Structure formats: C-alpha cells, structure tokens
Amino acid sequence: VVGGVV
C-alpha cells in the first residue's frame, strides 16, 4: 500500500 500528499 502507498500514499502521497502534496
């Protein structure tokens, strides 16, 4: 699982 936020 992976996530990213800008």
Ligand SMILES: O=C(O)C(F)(F)C(F)(F)F
């Ligand atoms: O996404 C993975 O690698 C996984 F192991 F299935 C999790 F359980 F972390 F979701």
Ligand SMILES: O=C(O)C(F)(F)C(F)(F)F
């Ligand atoms: O990106 C990588 O090299 C990895 F090892 F999968 C981490 F777990 F750090 F995400």
